[PDB]
Amino acid sequence: QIQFTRHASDVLLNLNRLRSRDILTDVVIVVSREQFRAHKTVLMACSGLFYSIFTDQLKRNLSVINLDPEINPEGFNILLDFMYTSRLNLREGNIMAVMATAMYLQMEHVVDTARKFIKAS
Numbered sequence: 001q002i003q004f005t006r007h008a009s010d011v012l013l014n015l016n017r018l019r020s021r022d023i024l025t026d027v028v029i030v031v032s033r034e035q036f037r038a039h040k041t042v043l044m045a046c047s048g049l050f051y052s053i054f055t056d057q058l059k060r061n062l063s064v065i066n067l068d069p070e071i072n073p074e075g076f077n078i079l080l081d082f083m084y085t086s087r088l089n090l091r092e093g094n095i096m097a098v099m100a101t102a103m104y105l106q107m108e109h110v111v112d113t114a115r116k117f118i119k120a121s
Contacts, residue, residue, distance in 0.1 A: 009086070012084065012085070012086065013085075015039065015042055015084060016084040016085055018039070019037070019038065019039065019042075019084055022037055024039060025037040025038055025039055026039060026040050026063065027039070027040050027043065027062070027063055027064070027065060028063065028064050028065075029043075029065050029067060029076070029080075030064060030065070030066045030067065031067045031071050031072075031073040031076045032067075032069060032071065032072070032073050033073075034073035034076075034077075036076065036077070036080055038080065038083075040054050040060075042083055042084065043083070046083040046105075046107065047083070047105040047106060047107055048105070048106025048107070049104065049105045049106045050065075050105070052106075053065060067104070068104065071100075071101055071104055072097040072100065072101060074094060074097050075094065075097035075098050075100060075101030075102075076101050078090075078094060078097075078098050078101070079098065079101050079102055079105060079107065079110065082110065088110060088113065088114075090113075090114065090117050092121055095114055095117055095118050095121070096118065098110070098114045099111055099114035099115060099118065102114060
């Protein structure tokens with residue numbers, strides 16, 4: 001009956017507040033020695049790669065995930081912030097790292113956007 005189009009944005013804002021206070025985080029993502037705590041549910045909801053990892057009954061219970069050593073942690077940090085905020089921070093010197101990380105994480109819409117911003121620069 002009544003759709004509240006703001007509701008999902010308010011939910012996401014609160015999920016980000018939980019992340020900043022490390023509440024109910026259940027996984028550490030290790031990217032070239034750098035560590036990032038997150039919620040598996042949010043990771044699965046945003047990334048085809050994390051969806052594939054955690055949908056596997058054998059990997060669903062893992063609390064540490066080590067990404068491919070070629071992944072740039074600066075790019076992962078920007079993508080993780082995007083997952084929890086809907087805001088993609090693109091600076092001249094980070095756009096290629098953002099594009100490559102988004103491709104690895106299978107976030108095709110972020111890839112397309114970063115592509116337009118490289119060409120525009």
